[PDB]
Design an enzyme around this catalytic site. Structure first.
Site, mmCIF file in Angstrom:
data_model
loop_
_atom_site.group_PDB
_atom_site.id
_atom_site.type_symbol
_atom_site.label_atom_id
_atom_site.label_comp_id
_atom_site.label_asym_id
_atom_site.label_seq_id
_atom_site.Cartn_x
_atom_site.Cartn_y
_atom_site.Cartn_z
ATOM 1 N N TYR A 366 0.772 -1.246 0.000
ATOM 2 C CA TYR A 366 0.000 0.000 0.000
ATOM 3 C C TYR A 366 0.804 1.298 0.000
ATOM 4 O O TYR A 366 0.259 2.344 -0.322
ATOM 5 C CB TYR A 366 -0.960 0.006 1.193
ATOM 6 C CG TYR A 366 -1.979 -1.118 1.139
ATOM 7 C CD1 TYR A 366 -3.090 -1.067 0.293
ATOM 8 C CD2 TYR A 366 -1.798 -2.261 1.903
ATOM 9 C CE1 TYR A 366 -4.003 -2.102 0.250
ATOM 10 C CE2 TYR A 366 -2.720 -3.293 1.879
ATOM 11 C CZ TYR A 366 -3.807 -3.217 1.041
ATOM 12 O OH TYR A 366 -4.709 -4.235 0.998
HETATM 13 C C1 LIG Z 1 1.397 5.849 3.416
HETATM 14 C C2 LIG Z 1 1.291 6.758 2.190
HETATM 15 O O1 LIG Z 1 1.951 6.141 1.078
HETATM 16 P P1 LIG Z 1 3.455 6.568 0.678
HETATM 17 O O2 LIG Z 1 4.368 5.980 1.742
HETATM 18 O O3 LIG Z 1 3.518 8.092 0.655
HETATM 19 O O4 LIG Z 1 3.578 5.921 -0.690
HETATM 20 C C3 LIG Z 1 -0.168 7.014 1.801
HETATM 21 N N1 LIG Z 1 -0.923 5.794 1.626
HETATM 22 C C4 LIG Z 1 -1.829 5.375 2.509
HETATM 23 O O5 LIG Z 1 -1.995 5.877 3.613
HETATM 24 C C5 LIG Z 1 -2.696 4.224 2.055
HETATM 25 C C6 LIG Z 1 -3.991 4.165 2.839
HETATM 26 C C7 LIG Z 1 -5.013 3.242 2.151
HETATM 27 C C8 LIG Z 1 -4.540 1.790 1.995
HETATM 28 C C9 LIG Z 1 -4.309 1.049 3.316
HETATM 29 C C10 LIG Z 1 -5.586 0.937 4.132
HETATM 30 S S1 LIG Z 1 -5.328 0.059 5.696
HETATM 31 C C11 LIG Z 1 -0.230 7.817 0.528
HETATM 32 O O6 LIG Z 1 -0.381 7.233 -0.587
HETATM 33 O O7 LIG Z 1 -0.142 9.069 0.610
#
Ligand SMILES: C[C@@H](OP(=O)(O)O)[C@H](NC(=O)CCCCCCS)C(=O)O
Ligand SMILES: C[C@@H](OP(=O)(O)O)[C@H](NC(=O)CCCCCCS)C(=O)O
Ligand SMILES: O=S(=O)(O)CCS
Ligand SMILES: [Ca+2]
Ligand SMILES: [Ca+2]
Ligand SMILES: [Ca+2]
Ligand SMILES: [Ca+2]
Ligand SMILES: [Ca+2]
Ligand SMILES: [Ca+2]
Ligand SMILES: [K+]
Ligand SMILES: [K+]
Ligand SMILES: [K+]
Lengths: 442, 248, 548, 442
Positions: A366
Site C-alpha cells: 500500500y
Molecule cells: C502511506 C502513504 O503512502 P506513501 O508511503 O507516501 O507511498 C499514503 N498511503 C496510505 O496511507 C494508504 C492508505 C489506504 C490503503 C491502506 C488501508 S489500511 C499515501 O499514498 O499518501
C-alpha cells in the site's frame, strides 16, 4: 535548574566523559552544540556540479526522463570548478570572511556550501539556503562561459529543476537534508522531514552516532512543535538523554550484556531489573504469581524503557545485520514490556502504534518502503514524539546490504557533502562535550 | 510632457486626449440633470448618498501625506464611489479603451480607470463623477453612434454597424431617429427606461470620425506605417527583456 | 488562394465578409437557434419534474439580438453552435481529460532489479508476459490471491488495462504483442529510432485505470490504484510471500521511484493532487497530443492540434471549471480551434519564415523575434480590419490577442528552432496589438504579457524556466484564459519544425501512441467535432448498473 | 562597500535626519532595525482570551458555525487573566528575565506574547511562536481552573481550532501576522504572506509608515527568495530606499508638489524632470517631436520610477481617499511613463502586469477582493518583486471608509496587539537610526 536530574555522559566506546551533568545541559534550548548542528543543517547545501554539467550537455532537465532536443549546451563546469565556486561564494557571502563556505569535493564534481548565518537572522525559515545557493551558481556559470541571454534559462533548469511549475525543485542538481516548507505535515515539522538514510549516510553508518543525530533532530523538532513545553518538557529531555545520548551508559551496557546471545526479550528483562535496582519502578502489588510494577516518575520510566528499546533494536537488527525487523522490535519490545510489568510502554503506546503501521507499510502493497526512506514527517512514522525514528536510524546503520533503497542508493550526494561536517558526522561527541562545558551554569 | 510617439493623425489625437492642456472639443450640450439621469445612480434632486461620514467627522490620523493631498470634493463629503462606462466601436470611434484610461489618469484626480476590449470604466466619488461625466459626454470623447454608455451587456465594439451607422447594443439604450438625424438616449447606462429621453444630437460624419479617431486601421492610418510609434514599442520590449535578465 | 477562414465566414453570415453593415434585433432572439430552443424546452421539463425553476430565457438580458453563430471546427467540415463545444455538452472533451487523468507511466526497471537482486529470481520476456496477463486481470479491480474477494464488474471497467514499451526491439518482440505499444508501428522511422534510443533497454508500463473510478475520485487516485494492482500482480506472477519486506520495495518503486505523473501537485491556494490539469507542463501536453506522429510533414498542423488540445483542456475544463465554473470559457478556447482562423495566420507566418530565413535557420536572437513577430501580428490584425465578419466572429479582444500572438509565437519558433524566442514573440505581439487597436483583452488578460518580456529570459528562482517546463502553475500563468493552450502550441512549434519526435518527455509521447485509448489523440479537432455532434461514446457510464 | 551609492534620509514629516548614508546600511542583511523588526514579527503572537472564554462557554469550537452541544465549560478566563498569563509566561520563557513577553491588554481580554528568541535559534522556521504560545495557554488555563482530563480537549480546541484535522489553525483564538508554512506559494515567501490590512492596522493608517513596513517585509523576502543576490541586489536595495524609505525625500517632495491639484500624469512629469535633472536619464536620440530617453543605470532609473509610483498612488488614492484605484495607478503610472520616455517601467513591466491582474481580481466575479486582503504571497500580487504591494499598503492607509473588508473588519486582533510594538508601528525612524549607527561599518 528547573529539573534536578543529573546524568553521567560517556563517549562512543562506553568510557566515562563527565559525571553528574544536569539534564538541561542536554536541552536543545541550552546546549550550544545542538544549536550549531541545527543551524548548520539549515544552512548547508550540496551542489552537484557534474550533474549540472551533464544535464546541460544532454538537455536532460526538469525531472525524470525529461529532455528538450535542441537545447544542449556543452560547458566545462567541472574543469573550471574553482573559478565558478569562487564567483558563487562572492554572491553567497554577506561580507568577506564571514561564515560562508564554498568547498569543492570529488575533484570539482561536487561542492559543499554553507550559506552565511546572517542571511537566516532576517529570514522567516530555511529556504534561503538552496535559493541563494542556486542563483549564485546559476549566475557564476553564466558568467564563467559567457552563456547568452537566450540560453541562460537552461542553466537555471539544470540547477533548480522544474520549479516553479512544480512546487518542489523537481530535477534539481542541488540537495539539502531539509525539504521544502510546503511538505511539512504540520507546522514545526521541518527537522522531522529528514530521510533516515540521509542521517545514516552522514554519520558513516556508525550506529551510536546515527542514533544520536536522529534523536537530536527529532527531539529538537519536539521543542519547535511545542510538544516539549510545560508538563512534557522533562519527558522529552530524558528521552533525548537516555535514548539518544547514552546517558548513564545504559544503552551501551544493555547492548554489551545482550549482544552475544540476546534477544528483544532478554534486553527487556535486563532493563526492568535495572529500573527496579535504580528505584525508577517498584512492586505496587502482587496478583497470583505476578508482580504489578508501579512508578511515581512516568517520565523516567519512559526514558529507561526508551533506552532498552534502542538497545533491543541494536541487539535484534544487529544480530540479523538486516534493518527490516526494526519495525517488529519497535512493536514487540513495547508489547512485551507492558505485559511483563503492568506499566505503559514507550511514549505511552505511541511507539507501539507507530511500529504497527511502520511494520504494515514496510511489508505491504500500500505504500511506505524500506526502513531507510521513512522519517519523522512521514505519515506512517510521525506519531511517536521522537522515540521511534532514532531506532530506525540505528537499524539502517547496522544493515550489511539487504536493502534496495539503501543509503548508497538514496543519499550519495548528501553523504559526500554533509559527512564532511564534523558536528554532523559525530554529533554525540560534540553534544556531550558542550553539555559538560555548560554543566555549572544550569 | 510628450505623451505618445508617432507622426500619424492617430498619434496626435492620442496625445491630445492625454494632454490636460488640450481643450477637448465640445460637440453637444447635455444638462446637469440629464447627466445624472444617464448615470442612473440617483434621482435628480436626491441628496448624495454616503458611504462614510464627511472627512471632518471621521477623524483621520495625523499624517503628512493626508495634509499634502487635497481630497476631491466628493471625498470630503463621503460620497459613494460610482462609475461611468463606455464602449467604443472599432469603426473609428474617437476615443478607444487604453486612450481613455491613459487620458483619465492624466486629466482627472482620484480616478480608478479600467480598460477592457469591449468596455472602459472610471470609478470615483459620485459628485466628482458627475462633473467628469459631463465632459466625457459633451466632448469628442463621445460620439452617439460609435460610442455607447453601458454599465452592462457591452457587446458591440467589434460588431458590424447597423444600417444607420449605429453600433450594436443588446439593450438598445441609444436610438437613432431617421426623421431627425439625431440619437436619443432612451435608457440609462444600466438599461432602465428613462421617463424622459435625452437628446444626444447628431452623429459625426464619416470623414470627421476618421480625422478624430485614435484607432489605427488599414482603411484609416495603419499602425505599421507609423514607424516611429512602432519603434518605441519594440524598444520597450527589448529593454524590458534586458532588465529582466540582468539590470546591471 | 482564399484565406482559410473565408468559407466559414460565408457560412455564418448573409453578408459578404468585407461588408461593414448588417441587421440586428429582428432575428427572433433565442428562437433563431435550434440549440437554444432545445435548452428552453429542456429547462421547462427540468423545472416541472423537480419543482424548482431552472433554465429560463426570460432571466437577465435577452440572447440573440445578433446572429448566434455556428462554428466550423478547424480542419473539419463540421459546423456547430458553440454550445456543442462546451465541455459539459461534449463527451469527447470529457473523455480527452479522463484519458489523461487516468494514465500513469510506471517503470519496471527498479521492480525487475528487486526480483533479481533481492528475491533472487529471473526476469525474462516470458515472466514479463505472465505478469502482464496477471495485471490485466487485476488492474480493472479483480482478485488474484485472497479467498472471498468481491470485484468490479468487468464491463464497467473495460477501458482499464496495462501495456508496456521498451527501446530494445528484441525484448519488445518476445513479449506477447497484445500488451506492447509497438514503437516501430506507431511512429515514422526517424521518430521511432529517436524514441527507442531515449528509452534504451528500459521497460515501462502505461497504466490506465477505469474512467468510472477517475470520475468518482480524482487524478491523485491514478498512481495509487496503479501501484496496488502492480503490487498484487508482482506477488501472484513471481510467487513470493503475499506481503513480505520486499513487497514494500515494489510499492515504493511503483508509487514514487519510477512513476511519471501526468501532472504534479499544486500549492494550497489552488490545492490539488497529482494528475490534475494545472500540474501538466506545456511540454507534456504537446507530447500527449499525437499529431506529431501522423502529421509530421506539416508543422503548422502539428502545432495547432496541440493548441486545440490545450485551449480546450486548459481554458475550458481547467480555468473554466476547476478554477471557476458556470457558463465558463468555451469561446475563449474555440477561437483557437475554429473557423480555420489561427490556421490562416500561422500558415502565413510559416511561409514568411520559409521565404525569409528557412525553417529553423534564423539566428536565435531578439532581431529575429522583432522581425517575425511584428510581421505576423500585423498580418493577423489586418485580417480583422479587412473582414468585418471576422472581427464580429472573434468578438472578444482576448480571443483575438491569443490567436494573433499564437501565430506570431509559433512562427518565431519555426524560424529559430527554440521555444524561448517563440515566447518572446508572443509577448511582443501583445504589445503591438495593444498599441494598434488601443485595446487587448479582458480586464486581467495581460498580467502575464506585461510581466512577460522580462521573464522570458530571466534566471531567477520563480521566474526562470524554459517554456517546455512551464505550465499552468508557473506563477504569472496561474490565472488567465487565452494563454496556456497557445503556449503548449509554441512549445510544440520548434520541435515540429525540427522534426523532433517529442518536446519534453519521450515516455509521455510513447504512452499515448495507443489505439486502445478511448479518445483519438491523433485527431483532436476531429474528435471535438464528433463530440459536438453527439456521436462520441465515452467510457465510465453507469447504464449497466441502473434502471433501463 | 560593495556599492558606492549614498542616500539622504528623512523623517515622515520631510525633515532631513541623516546625510549621505551608504546604501547598504539600509540592507536587510546589515541593518539591525530591520533584523529586530523581522525577528519581532516572527516571534509575536496575539492571544484572544475573551475569544477562548466565549468559545468554551458556548462550545463553539473548530471553525465557522461549529458547536458541540453538551461540551460547554464556563471558565472565568478574563477575570483570572493575570494569573493565567503569568503561568503561561513561565512555560514560554527559556530562562527568567530573557526576552519573553506576555502582556495583558483590554482588561485581560487580550495578550501580547513574544516568544523568546532562543527558541528560534534552534528551530527551522517560525511556527514555534503560535505552537509554544498555544500549549502554554492551554496548560495555564487547565491549571488555573483544575479543568478535568475529560474536558481539557475543549480548551485545546478553543485555543488552536480544528488543527490537525485541518492543516490551518481553523477557528483558533490566537493570531500572528505570518501564516503557516504550508501556505507559501514558493519557498522563501513567508514574509510575503502578511495581509495588507494587517500592515495598515499595525501602523495606525499612517501612510508613510505603512509603506515603509510593507517595503521592509517585501524587500526582506526578496533576499530570502534569492532574488536580491548578485546582479539584482543593487536594484532591490535602491527600491527599498527610494520607494519605501523616502530616500532623498523624493516620494515626499513629489507628493508635496502634486497633492493639491495633481494626478498620476502630473506626478510622472515631475519625476521624469527630476530624473533628468539628476543625471539618471538623458536624451538618447530624437524622433519627430519626440525625445527618446536612455540610461546607463537601469537600477537607479527603476528606483526613481518606483518613488514616483508611490507618490502617484498617494496623490491619486489620497485625492479619492479611496483605495480601490491603486490597481489603476499601478497599471497606468507604468504604462504612461513608458510612452512618455521610451524607458521601461517599474520592475521592467512586472508592476504593470501585477496591476492588470490586481485590477481584474478587485473588480470581477472570479476571486480576489478589496485591496486590503492582498499580500505578496497572493497569486494575484506575487509577481512584482517588492515594488507593488507597498503602494497597496499606502492606498489602504489613505482609505476613509469605502471598503467592506477594511482593516477594522479583518485585522482588529492584530491591530490591538501588534500596534503596541513601537518598531512595528513606526519602523522608519528605527531603520534610519540603525543605518546611522552602522554607516561606518559598511
Ligand atoms: C502511506 C502513504 O503512502 P506513501 O508511503 O507516501 O507511498 C499514503 N498511503 C496510505 O496511507 C494508504 C492508505 C489506504 C490503503 C491502506 C488501508 S489500511 C499515501 O499514498 O499518501
Ligand atoms: C485568484 C484566486 O482566487 P482567490 O483570490 O484565492 O479567491 C484563484 N482563482 C483564479 O485564479 C481564477 C482563474 C479562473 C477564472 C479567471 C480566468 S481569466 C483561486 O480560486 O485559487
Ligand atoms: O470583464 S472582466 O475582464 O472582469 C471578465 C472577462 S470574462
Ligand atoms: Ca539477564
Ligand atoms: Ca453566406
Ligand atoms: Ca435571458
Ligand atoms: Ca519488432
Ligand atoms: Ca527502424
Ligand atoms: Ca547620530
Ligand atoms: K541520575
Ligand atoms: K455625505
Ligand atoms: K534496435
Amino acid at each position: 535548574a528547573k529539573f534536578e536530574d543529573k546524568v553521567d555522559l560517556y563517549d562512543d566506546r562506553g568510557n566515562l566523559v563527565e559525571e553528574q551533568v544536569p539534564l538541561e545541559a542536554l536541552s536543545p534550548l541550552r546546549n550550544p552544540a545542538i544549536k550549531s548542528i541545527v543551524q548548520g543543517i539549515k544552512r548547508t547545501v550540496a551542489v552537484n556540479l557534474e550533474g549540472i554539467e551533464n544535464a546541460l550537455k544532454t538537455a536532460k532537465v526538469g525531472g525524470p526522463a525529461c529532455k528538450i532536443m535542441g537545447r544542449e549546451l556543452d560547458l566545462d563546469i567541472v574543469g573550471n570548478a574553482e573559478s565558478i565556486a569562487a564567483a558563487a561564494k562572492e554572491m553567497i557571502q554577506v561580507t568577506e570572511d564571514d561564515d560562508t563556505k564554498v568547498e569543492l569535493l570529488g575533484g570539482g564534481k561536487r561542492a559543499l556550501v554553507q550559506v552565511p548565518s546572517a542571511r537566516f537572522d532576517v529570514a522567516a525559515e530555511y529556504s534561503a539556503a538552496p535559493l541563494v545557493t542556486a542563483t549564485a551558481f546559476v549566475q557564476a556559470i553564466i558568467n564563467e562561459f559567457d552563456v547568452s541571454m537566450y540560453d541562460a534559462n537552461m542553466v537555471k533548469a539544470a540547477v533548480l529543476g522544474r520549479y516553479p511549475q512544480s512546487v518542489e525543485y523537481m530535477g534539481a542538481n542541488i540537495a539539502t537534508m531539509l525539504d521544502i516548507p510546503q511538505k511539512l505535515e504540520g507546522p514545526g515539522y521541518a527537522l522531522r522531514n529528514i530521510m533516515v538514510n540521509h542521517v545514516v549516510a552522514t554519520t558513516l553508518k556508525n550506529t551510536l552516532q546515527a542514533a544520536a543525530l536522529s534523536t537530536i533532530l527529532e527531539q529538537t523538532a519536539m521543542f519547535e512543535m511545542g510538544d516539549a513545553v510545560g508538563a512534557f518538557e522533562r519527558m522529552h529531555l530524558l528521552g533525548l538523554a537516555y535514548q539518544g545520548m547514552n546517558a548513564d551508559n545504559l544503552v551501551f551496557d544493555l547492548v554489551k550484556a545482550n549482544g552475544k546471545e540476546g534477544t528483544v526479550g532478554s534486553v527487556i528483562a535486563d532493563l526492568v531489573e535495572r529500573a527496579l535496582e535504580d528505584g525508577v519502578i517498584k512492586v505496587e502489588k502482587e496478583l497470583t504469581d505476578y508482580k504489578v510494577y508501579g512508578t511515581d516518575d512516568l517520565a523516567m520510566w519512559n526514558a529507561y524503557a526508551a533506552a532498552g528499546l534502542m538497545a533491543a533494536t541494536m541487539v535484534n537488527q544487529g544480530a540479523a545485520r538486516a534493518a527490516q525487523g526494526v519495525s517488529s522490535t519497535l512493536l514487540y519490545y513495547n508489547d512485551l514490556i507492558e505485559f511483563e510489568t503492568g506499566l505503559p510502554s514507550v511514549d505511552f503506546g505511541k511507539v507501539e502504534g507507530t511500529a504497527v503501521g511502520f511494520s504494515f507499510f514496510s511489508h505491504s502493497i500500500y505504500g511506505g518502503g524500506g526502513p531507510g526512506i521513512f522519517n519523522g514527517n512521514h505519515i506512517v512514522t510521525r506519531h511517536s514524539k521522537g522515540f521511534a525514528i532514532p531506532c530506525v536510524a540505528a537499524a539502517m546503520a547496522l544493515d550489511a546490504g539487504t536493502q534496495m533503497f539503501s543509503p548508497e542508493a538514496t543519499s550519495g550526494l548528501i553523504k559526500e557533502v554533509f559527512s564532511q561536517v564534523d558536528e554532523f558526522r559525530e554529533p554525540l561527541k560534540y553534544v556531550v562535550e558542550a553539555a559538560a562545558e555548560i554543566k555549572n551554569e544550569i | 510632457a510628450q505623451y505618445y510617439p508617432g507622426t500619424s493623425k492617430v498619434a496626435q489625437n492620442r496625445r491630445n486626449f492625454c494632454n490636460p492642456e488640450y481643450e477637448l472639443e465640445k460637440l453637444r450640450e447635455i444638462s446637469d440633470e440629464d447627466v445624472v439621469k444617464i448615470l442612473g445612480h440617483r434621482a435628480p434632486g436626491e441628496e448624495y448618498p454616503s458611504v462614510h461620514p464627511p472627512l471632518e467627522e471621521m477623524d483621520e490620523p495625523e499624517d503628512a501625506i493626508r495634509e499634502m493631498v487635497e481630497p476631491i470634493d466628493g471625498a470630503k463629503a463621503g460620497d459613494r464611489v460610482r462609475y461611468i462606462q463606455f464602449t467604443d466601436s472599432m469603426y473609428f470611434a474617437p476615443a478607444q479603451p487604453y486612450v481613455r484610461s491613459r487620458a483619465y489618469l492624466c486629466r482627472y484626480r482620484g480616478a480608478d480607470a479600467g480598460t477592457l476590449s469591449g468596455r472602459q470604466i472610471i470609478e470615483t466619488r459620485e459628485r466628482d463623477l458627475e462633473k467628469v461625466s459631463k465632459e466625457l459626454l459633451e466632448t469628442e470623447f463621445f460620439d452617439p453612434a460609435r460610442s455607447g454608455v453601458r454599465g452592462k451587456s457591452v457587446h458591440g465594439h467589434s460588431l458590424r454597424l447597423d444600417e444607420d451607422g449605429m453600433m450594436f447594443d443588446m439593450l438598445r439604450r441609444q436610438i437613432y431617429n431617421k426623421d431627425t438625424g439625431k440619437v436619443e438616449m432612451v435608457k440609462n447606462q444600466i438599461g432602465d427606461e428613462l421617463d424622459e429621453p435625452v437628446d444626444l444630437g447628431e452623429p459625426l460624419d464619416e470623414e470627421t470620425l476618421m480625422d478624430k479617431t485614435t484607432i489605427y486601421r488599414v482603411d484609416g492610418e495603419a499602425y505599421r506605417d507609423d514607424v516611429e510609434a512602432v519603434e518605441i514599442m519594440q524598444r520597450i520590449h527589448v529593454l524590458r527583456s534586458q532588465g529582466g535578465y540582468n539590470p546591471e | 488562394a482564399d484565406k482559410l477562414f473565408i468559407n466559414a465566414l460565408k457560412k455564418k453570415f448573409e453578408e459578404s465578409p468585407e461588408e461593414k453593415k448588417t441587421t440586428f434585433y429582428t432575428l427572433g432572439g433565442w428562437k433563431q437557434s435550434e440549440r437554444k430552443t432545445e435548452f428552453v424546452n429542456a429547462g421547462k421539463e427540468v423545472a416541472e419534474k423537480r419543482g424548482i425553476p431552472q433554465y429560463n430565457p426570460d432571466i437577465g438580458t435577452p440572447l440573440g439580438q445578433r446572429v448566434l453563430m455556428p462554428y466550423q471546427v478547424s480542419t473539419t467540415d463540421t459546423y456547430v453552435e458553440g454550445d456543442d463545444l462546451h465541455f459539459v455538452n461534449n463527451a469527447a472533451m470529457q473523455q480527452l481529460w479522463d484519458d489523461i487523468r487516468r494514465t500513469v507511466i510506471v517503470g519496471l526497471n527498479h521492480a525487475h532489479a528487486v526480483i533479481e537482486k533481492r528475491l533472487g529470481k529471473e526476469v525474462t520476456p516470458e515472466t514479463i508476459t505472465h505478469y502482464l496477463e496477471t495485471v490485466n486481470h487485476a488492474m480493472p479491480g479483480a482478485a488474484v490471491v485472497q479467498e472471498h474477494m468481491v470485484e468490479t464488474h468487468p464491463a464497467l471497467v473495460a477501458d482499464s488495462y496495462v501495456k508496456v514499451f521498451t527501446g530494445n526491439d528484441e525484448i519488445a518482440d518476445e513479449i506477447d504483442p497484445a500488451f506492447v505499444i509497438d514503437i516501430n508501428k506507431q511512429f515514422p522511422e526517424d521518430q521511432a529510432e529517436t524514441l527507442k534510443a531515449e528509452v534504451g533497454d528500459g521497460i515501462w508500463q502505461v497504466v490506465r485505470i477505469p474512467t468510472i473510478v477517475s470520475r468518482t475520485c480524482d487524478g491523485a487516485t491514478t498512481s495509487r490504484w496503479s501501484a496496488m494492482q502492480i503490487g498484487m500482480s508482482m506477488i501472484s506472477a513471481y510467487k513470493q510471500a503475499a506481503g513480505e519486506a520486499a513487497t514494500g520495495d515494489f510499492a515504493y518503486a511503483a508509487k514514487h521511484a519510477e512513476v511519471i505523473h501526468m501532472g504534479t501537485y499544486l500549492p494550497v491556494r489552488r490545492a490539488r493532487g497529482e494528475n490534475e490539469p494545472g500540474g501538466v507542463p506545456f511540454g507534456y501536453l504537446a507530447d500527449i497530443c499525437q499529431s506529431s506522429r501522423v502529421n509530421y510533414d506539416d508543422p503548422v498542423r502539428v502545432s495547432l492540434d496541440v493548441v486545440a488540445t490545450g485551449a480546450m483542456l486548459y481554458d475550458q475544463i481547467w480555468l473554466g471549471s476547476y478554477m471557476s465554473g458556470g457558463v465558463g470559457f468555451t469561446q475563449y478556447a474555440t477561437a483557437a480551434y475554429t473557423d480555420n482562423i489561427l490556421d490562416d495566420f500561422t500558415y502565413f507566418g510559416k511561409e514568411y519564415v520559409e521565404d525569409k530565413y528557412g525553417l529553423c535557420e534564423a539566428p536565435n536572437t531578439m532581431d529575429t523575434v522583432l522581425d517575425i513577430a511584428t510581421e505576423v501580428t500585423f498580418y493577423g490584425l489586418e485580417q480583422y480590419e479587412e473582414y468585418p465578419a471576422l472581427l464580429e466572429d472573434q468578438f472578444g479582444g482576448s480571443q483575438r490577442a491569443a490567436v494573433v500572438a499564437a501565430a506570431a509565437g509559433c512562427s518565431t519558433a519555426f524560424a529559430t528552432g527554440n521555444a524561448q524566442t517563440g515566447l518572446s514573440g508572443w509577448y511582443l505581439s501583445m504589445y503591438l496589438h495593444k498599441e494598434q487597436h488601443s485595446r487587448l483583452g479582458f480586464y486581467g488578460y495581460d498580467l502575464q504579457d506585461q510581466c512577460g518580456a522580462s521573464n522570458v529570459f530571466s534566471i531567477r528562482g520563480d521566474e526562470g524556466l524554459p517554456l517546455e517546463l512551464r505550465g499552468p502553475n508557473y506563477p504569472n500563468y496561474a490565472m488567465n484564459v487565452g494563454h496556456q493552450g497557445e503556449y503548449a502550441g509554441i512549445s510544440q512549434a520548434p520541435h515540429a519544425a525540427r522534426g523532433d519526435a517529442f518536446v519534453f518527455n519521450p515516455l509521455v509521447k510513447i504512452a499515448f501512441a495507443d489505439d486502445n485509448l478511448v479518445f483519438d489523440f491523433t485527431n483532436v479537432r476531429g474528435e471535438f467535432a464528433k463530440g459536438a455532434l453527439r456521436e462520441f461514446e465515452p467510457a465510465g457510464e453507469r447504464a449497466l448498473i441502473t434502471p433501463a
